[PDB]
């Protein structure tokens, strides 16, 4: 009896359950939202212990057939903490690796940006936004200079990619923090449940994107805070906002 458990983000867990209905065994798989790319291997109660890159070749009456991809890379559940971003910071995500890359942004003076490698349709998960997990209080109480990469996860958690992990040479396990801001974005941040990173956010397209198109997201800072306005945002953002409101076609 094969069970499939689908997450709202489109990913899924699949395998035969044990006597106790637990997703425990050596033939369990996490399947990415493309319904093709998979991490296949040892899981315990749905937690990835040793998953290897695989392809979902076909499914017959709910029964999946996977075949391992070449290579020796293995992945495991490795949730970040307040001060550990990953146990394998330089081990990239294979699904992300086939879809996006980091390069100089097309946006003037905006450092690096995130780009698509492929033509995909709307609502496509492209990249993952993993990071250390800290409190809103910590983030809200410190300088904007330390808040370039903070992204609200939920009511108790903010995800951050702090120095020195904001440099690909030090951290490339996920790349969501490299997407620059735009008031006319082609992507959005969305919830994601990842077998390695746990509950995080992802970057999902709003519409079809082409190969080599820069991926942008609206950062969503508060433009008019309740405690006397002037957007609670970095200067570059406030500047771009003025430039946006101007040039806007009404």
């Amino acid at each position: 009896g094969v069970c499939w458990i689908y997450y709202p983000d489109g990913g899924s867990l699949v395998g035969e359950v044990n006597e106790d209905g637990e997703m425990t065994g050596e033939k369990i798989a996490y399947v990415y939202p493309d319904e093709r790319t998979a991490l296949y291997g040892k899981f315990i109660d749905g937690e990835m212990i040793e998953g290897k890159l695989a392809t979902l070749m076909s499914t017959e009456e709910g029964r999946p057939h996977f075949e391992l991809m070449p290579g020796n890379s293995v992945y495991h559940f490795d949730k970040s903490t307040s001060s550990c971003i990953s146990t394998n910071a330089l081990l990239p995500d294979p699904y992300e690796s086939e879809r996006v890359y980091v390069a100089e942004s097309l946006i003037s003076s905006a450092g690096e940006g995130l780009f698509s490698k492929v033509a995909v349709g709307p609502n496509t998960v492209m990249s993952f936004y993993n990071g250390v997990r800290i409190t809103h209080q910590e983030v809200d109480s410190r300088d904007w200079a330390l808040n370039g990469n903070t992204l609200s996860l939920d009511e108790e958690t903010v995800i951050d990619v702090p120095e020195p992990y904001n440099h690909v040479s030090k951290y490339c396990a996920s790349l969501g923090h490299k997407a620059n801001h735009s008031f006319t974005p082609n992507c959005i941040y969305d919830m994601f449940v990842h077998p390695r990173f746990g509950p995080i956010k992802c970057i999902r397209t709003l519409r079809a994107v082409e190969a080599d198109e820069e991926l942008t997201v609206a950062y969503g800072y508060d433009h008019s805070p309740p405690g006397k306005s002037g957007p609670e945002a970095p200067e570059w953002y406030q500047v771009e906002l003025k430039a946006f409101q101007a040039t806007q076609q009404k």
Binding site: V139, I188, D190, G220
Partner: peptide
Amino acid sequence: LKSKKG
């Protein structure tokens, strides 16, 4: 506040 909001 000082963090992107999905």
